[PDB]
Amino acid sequence: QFAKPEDAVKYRQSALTLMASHFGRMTPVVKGQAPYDAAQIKANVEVLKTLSALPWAAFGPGTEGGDARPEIWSDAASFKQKQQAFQDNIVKLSAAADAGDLDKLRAAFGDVGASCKACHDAYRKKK
Template structure:
Protein backbone atom coordinates (compact mmCIF):
# COMPACT_ATOMS: atom_id res chain seq x y z
CA UNK A 1 0.00 0.00 0.00
CA UNK A 2 2.85 2.39 0.81
CA UNK A 3 4.45 1.82 -2.59
CA UNK A 4 1.12 2.56 -4.30
CA UNK A 5 0.81 5.82 -2.35
CA UNK A 6 4.34 6.80 -3.28
CA UNK A 7 3.64 5.99 -6.92
CA UNK A 8 0.40 7.99 -6.88
CA UNK A 9 2.19 10.94 -5.26
CA UNK A 10 4.92 10.81 -7.88
CA UNK A 11 2.36 10.69 -10.69
CA UNK A 12 0.47 13.67 -9.26
CA UNK A 13 3.68 15.63 -8.83
CA UNK A 14 4.65 14.95 -12.44
CA UNK A 15 1.20 15.94 -13.69
CA UNK A 16 1.20 19.17 -11.71
CA UNK A 17 4.71 20.07 -12.83
CA UNK A 18 3.70 19.63 -16.46
CA UNK A 19 0.82 22.09 -15.97
CA UNK A 20 3.08 24.69 -14.45
CA UNK A 21 5.88 24.32 -16.98
CA UNK A 22 6.63 27.32 -19.19
CA UNK A 23 4.23 27.71 -22.09
CA UNK A 24 6.89 26.84 -24.65
CA UNK A 25 7.44 23.50 -22.89
CA UNK A 26 3.71 22.69 -22.99
CA UNK A 27 3.55 22.80 -26.80
CA UNK A 28 5.67 20.79 -29.23
CA UNK A 29 6.09 23.83 -31.48
CA UNK A 30 4.98 27.47 -31.46
CA UNK A 31 2.27 26.78 -34.06
CA UNK A 32 0.65 24.39 -31.56
CA UNK A 33 0.39 27.21 -29.02
CA UNK A 34 -1.15 29.50 -31.63
CA UNK A 35 -3.74 26.85 -32.56
CA UNK A 36 -4.51 26.17 -28.89
CA UNK A 37 -5.10 29.80 -27.95
CA UNK A 38 -7.11 30.47 -31.11
CA UNK A 39 -9.31 27.47 -30.35
CA UNK A 40 -9.82 28.60 -26.74
CA UNK A 41 -10.62 32.17 -27.79
CA UNK A 42 -13.03 30.90 -30.47
CA UNK A 43 -14.90 28.92 -27.82
CA UNK A 44 -15.01 31.97 -25.56
CA UNK A 45 -16.42 34.09 -28.39
CA UNK A 46 -19.00 31.43 -29.21
CA UNK A 47 -20.29 31.11 -25.68
CA UNK A 48 -20.22 34.85 -25.12
CA UNK A 49 -22.10 35.42 -28.38
CA UNK A 50 -24.82 32.95 -27.40
CA UNK A 51 -25.92 35.33 -24.69
CA UNK A 52 -26.09 38.41 -26.88
CA UNK A 53 -29.66 37.90 -28.15
CA UNK A 54 -30.87 37.52 -24.57
CA UNK A 55 -28.99 40.60 -23.38
CA UNK A 56 -30.37 42.61 -26.31
CA UNK A 57 -33.92 41.45 -25.57
CA UNK A 58 -34.14 39.50 -28.84
CA UNK A 59 -34.55 36.15 -27.09
CA UNK A 60 -36.32 35.15 -23.87
CA UNK A 61 -34.33 35.24 -20.66
CA UNK A 62 -33.65 31.78 -19.27
CA UNK A 63 -31.73 32.45 -16.07
CA UNK A 64 -30.56 28.86 -15.70
CA UNK A 65 -29.27 28.68 -19.28
CA UNK A 66 -27.38 31.95 -18.85
CA UNK A 67 -25.97 30.79 -15.53
CA UNK A 68 -24.74 27.52 -17.08
CA UNK A 69 -23.25 29.31 -20.08
CA UNK A 70 -21.41 31.80 -17.88
CA UNK A 71 -20.10 28.96 -15.72
CA UNK A 72 -18.61 27.41 -18.84
CA UNK A 73 -17.23 30.80 -19.90
CA UNK A 74 -15.58 31.10 -16.52
CA UNK A 75 -13.72 27.86 -17.14
CA UNK A 76 -12.84 28.79 -20.72
CA UNK A 77 -11.50 32.18 -19.60
CA UNK A 78 -8.61 30.41 -17.88
CA UNK A 79 -7.42 28.50 -20.96
CA UNK A 80 -5.76 30.71 -23.59
CA UNK A 81 -3.17 32.49 -21.45
CA UNK A 82 -0.61 29.67 -21.14
CA UNK A 83 -0.33 29.70 -24.92
CA UNK A 84 1.00 33.28 -24.96
CA UNK A 85 4.40 32.48 -23.45
CA UNK A 86 7.79 33.37 -24.86
CA UNK A 87 8.45 31.62 -28.12
CA UNK A 88 4.76 31.35 -29.04
CA UNK A 89 4.55 34.48 -31.17
CA UNK A 90 2.30 34.38 -34.21
CA UNK A 91 -1.28 34.08 -35.26
CA UNK A 92 -3.40 37.20 -34.83
CA UNK A 93 -1.42 38.31 -31.77
CA UNK A 94 0.56 41.50 -32.29
CA UNK A 95 4.20 41.64 -31.12
CA UNK A 96 3.07 43.96 -28.31
CA UNK A 97 1.67 40.90 -26.48
CA UNK A 98 5.31 40.04 -25.71
CA UNK A 99 6.97 43.48 -25.75
CA UNK A 100 4.30 44.90 -23.41
CA UNK A 101 3.76 41.80 -21.31
CA UNK A 102 2.65 43.77 -18.24
CA UNK A 103 0.02 45.69 -20.23
CA UNK A 104 -1.21 42.44 -21.77
CA UNK A 105 -1.38 40.87 -18.30
CA UNK A 106 -3.46 43.81 -17.05
CA UNK A 107 -5.94 43.37 -19.91
CA UNK A 108 -6.08 39.60 -19.27
CA UNK A 109 -6.70 40.18 -15.57
CA UNK A 110 -9.43 42.75 -16.28
CA UNK A 111 -11.13 40.25 -18.59
CA UNK A 112 -10.99 37.51 -15.96
CA UNK A 113 -12.30 39.88 -13.27
CA UNK A 114 -15.19 40.89 -15.53
CA UNK A 115 -16.00 37.23 -16.21
CA UNK A 116 -16.13 36.67 -12.43
CA UNK A 117 -18.52 39.63 -12.09
CA UNK A 118 -20.65 38.20 -14.91
CA UNK A 119 -20.79 34.92 -13.00
CA UNK A 120 -22.00 36.77 -9.89
CA UNK A 121 -24.62 38.60 -11.96
CA UNK A 122 -25.77 35.37 -13.61
CA UNK A 123 -26.00 33.67 -10.23
CA UNK A 124 -28.25 36.50 -9.01
CA UNK A 125 -30.80 35.79 -11.74
CA UNK A 126 -31.22 39.54 -12.32
CA UNK A 127 -31.20 40.25 -16.06
CA UNK A 128 -30.29 43.93 -15.57
CA UNK A 129 -27.17 42.89 -13.63
CA UNK A 130 -26.35 40.34 -16.34
CA UNK A 131 -26.68 43.03 -19.02
CA UNK A 132 -24.34 45.40 -17.20
CA UNK A 133 -21.75 42.71 -16.50
CA UNK A 134 -22.03 41.39 -20.08
CA UNK A 135 -21.23 44.88 -21.38
CA UNK A 136 -18.16 45.08 -19.15
CA UNK A 137 -16.87 41.73 -20.43
CA UNK A 138 -17.40 42.90 -24.00
CA UNK A 139 -15.54 46.13 -23.27
CA UNK A 140 -12.59 44.22 -21.81
CA UNK A 141 -12.49 41.98 -24.92
CA UNK A 142 -12.51 45.03 -27.18
CA UNK A 143 -9.84 46.80 -25.16
CA UNK A 144 -7.47 43.85 -25.47
CA UNK A 145 -8.24 43.30 -29.15
CA UNK A 146 -7.66 46.98 -29.92
CA UNK A 147 -4.22 46.84 -28.30
CA UNK A 148 -2.97 43.32 -28.95
CA UNK A 149 -4.80 41.73 -31.88
CA UNK A 150 -3.68 42.24 -35.48
CA UNK A 151 -6.25 43.97 -37.65
CA UNK A 152 -7.67 41.80 -40.40
Protein backbone atom coordinates in the same frame (compact mmCIF):
# COMPACT_ATOMS: atom_id res chain seq x y z
CA GLN B 1 2.12 21.43 -23.49
CA PHE B 2 3.06 22.70 -26.95
CA ALA B 3 5.71 21.04 -29.11
CA LYS B 4 6.13 24.11 -31.36
CA PRO B 5 4.85 27.70 -31.37
CA GLU B 6 2.25 26.66 -33.99
CA ASP B 7 0.68 24.37 -31.42
CA ALA B 8 0.29 27.22 -28.91
CA VAL B 9 -1.22 29.37 -31.65
CA LYS B 10 -3.75 26.63 -32.58
CA TYR B 11 -4.65 26.18 -28.93
CA ARG B 12 -5.25 29.83 -28.15
CA GLN B 13 -7.20 30.40 -31.38
CA SER B 14 -9.44 27.44 -30.50
CA ALA B 15 -9.90 28.67 -26.93
CA LEU B 16 -10.78 32.18 -28.09
CA THR B 17 -13.22 30.76 -30.70
CA LEU B 18 -15.03 28.83 -27.93
CA MET B 19 -15.10 31.89 -25.66
CA ALA B 20 -16.50 33.98 -28.44
CA SER B 21 -19.34 31.44 -28.97
CA HIS B 22 -20.19 31.20 -25.26
CA PHE B 23 -20.17 34.94 -24.91
CA GLY B 24 -21.88 35.86 -28.20
CA ARG B 25 -24.67 33.31 -27.93
CA MET B 26 -26.06 35.38 -25.03
CA THR B 27 -26.46 38.53 -27.11
CA PRO B 28 -30.16 37.78 -28.01
CA VAL B 29 -30.90 37.09 -24.34
CA VAL B 30 -29.31 40.38 -23.20
CA LYS B 31 -31.33 42.19 -25.87
CA GLY B 32 -34.58 40.47 -24.95
CA GLN B 33 -34.88 38.90 -28.42
CA ALA B 34 -34.64 35.47 -26.79
CA PRO B 35 -36.10 34.45 -23.42
CA TYR B 36 -34.11 34.67 -20.17
CA ASP B 37 -33.82 31.32 -18.38
CA ALA B 38 -31.72 31.98 -15.31
CA ALA B 39 -30.52 28.37 -14.97
CA GLN B 40 -29.49 28.15 -18.64
CA ILE B 41 -27.51 31.38 -18.41
CA LYS B 42 -25.90 30.40 -15.07
CA ALA B 43 -24.65 27.17 -16.64
CA ASN B 44 -23.45 28.94 -19.78
CA VAL B 45 -21.52 31.59 -17.88
CA GLU B 46 -19.87 28.79 -15.85
CA VAL B 47 -18.58 27.31 -19.12
CA LEU B 48 -17.43 30.81 -20.18
CA LYS B 49 -15.57 31.30 -16.89
CA THR B 50 -13.64 28.09 -17.45
CA LEU B 51 -12.87 28.96 -21.05
CA SER B 52 -11.86 32.57 -20.26
CA ALA B 53 -8.97 31.34 -18.06
CA LEU B 54 -7.45 29.21 -20.86
CA PRO B 55 -5.98 31.34 -23.65
CA TRP B 56 -3.30 33.18 -21.68
CA ALA B 57 -1.03 30.20 -20.92
CA ALA B 58 -0.81 29.67 -24.71
CA PHE B 59 0.90 33.04 -25.19
CA GLY B 60 4.13 31.76 -23.57
CA PRO B 61 7.40 33.39 -24.50
CA GLY B 62 8.52 32.72 -28.04
CA THR B 63 4.97 31.79 -29.28
CA GLU B 64 4.76 34.71 -31.69
CA GLY B 65 2.36 33.80 -34.47
CA GLY B 66 -1.19 33.95 -35.70
CA ASP B 67 -2.76 37.38 -35.28
CA ALA B 68 -0.98 38.05 -31.97
CA ARG B 69 0.84 41.40 -31.86
CA PRO B 70 4.44 41.33 -30.60
CA GLU B 71 3.55 43.88 -27.89
CA ILE B 72 2.12 40.93 -25.88
CA TRP B 73 5.71 39.94 -25.11
CA SER B 74 7.59 43.23 -24.92
CA ASP B 75 5.53 44.34 -21.88
CA ALA B 76 4.46 41.21 -20.08
CA ALA B 77 3.01 43.09 -17.09
CA SER B 78 0.66 45.15 -19.25
CA PHE B 79 -0.67 42.11 -21.15
CA LYS B 80 -1.20 40.31 -17.85
CA GLN B 81 -3.16 43.30 -16.52
CA LYS B 82 -5.48 43.16 -19.56
CA GLN B 83 -6.20 39.43 -19.27
CA GLN B 84 -6.65 39.62 -15.49
CA ALA B 85 -8.94 42.62 -15.83
CA PHE B 86 -10.94 40.73 -18.48
CA GLN B 87 -11.27 37.72 -16.18
CA ASP B 88 -12.53 40.00 -13.42
CA ASN B 89 -15.17 41.38 -15.84
CA ILE B 90 -16.18 37.73 -16.33
CA VAL B 91 -16.42 37.46 -12.52
CA LYS B 92 -19.03 40.27 -12.53
CA LEU B 93 -20.93 38.41 -15.26
CA SER B 94 -20.76 35.18 -13.19
CA ALA B 95 -22.07 36.98 -10.12
CA ALA B 96 -24.98 38.39 -12.15
CA ALA B 97 -25.77 35.00 -13.69
CA ASP B 98 -25.56 33.23 -10.32
CA ALA B 99 -27.96 35.83 -8.85
CA GLY B 100 -30.45 35.48 -11.72
CA ASP B 101 -30.24 39.25 -12.14
CA LEU B 102 -30.98 40.24 -15.74
CA ASP B 103 -30.12 43.91 -15.17
CA LYS B 104 -26.74 43.04 -13.73
CA LEU B 105 -26.24 40.53 -16.53
CA ARG B 106 -26.84 43.21 -19.22
CA ALA B 107 -24.45 45.65 -17.57
CA ALA B 108 -21.75 43.04 -17.05
CA PHE B 109 -22.16 41.75 -20.57
CA GLY B 110 -21.45 45.23 -21.96
CA ASP B 111 -18.35 45.60 -19.79
CA VAL B 112 -17.05 42.19 -20.81
CA GLY B 113 -17.48 43.09 -24.47
CA ALA B 114 -15.59 46.33 -23.96
CA SER B 115 -12.76 44.35 -22.33
CA CYS B 116 -12.54 42.00 -25.31
CA LYS B 117 -12.17 45.04 -27.56
CA ALA B 118 -9.66 46.82 -25.27
CA CYS B 119 -7.35 43.84 -25.58
CA HIS B 120 -7.82 43.51 -29.35
CA ASP B 121 -7.01 47.21 -29.83
CA ALA B 122 -3.62 46.79 -28.15
CA TYR B 123 -2.75 43.17 -28.95
CA ARG B 124 -4.49 41.71 -32.01
CA LYS B 125 -3.31 42.35 -35.59
CA LYS B 126 -5.76 43.45 -38.29
CA LYS B 127 -7.06 40.53 -40.38
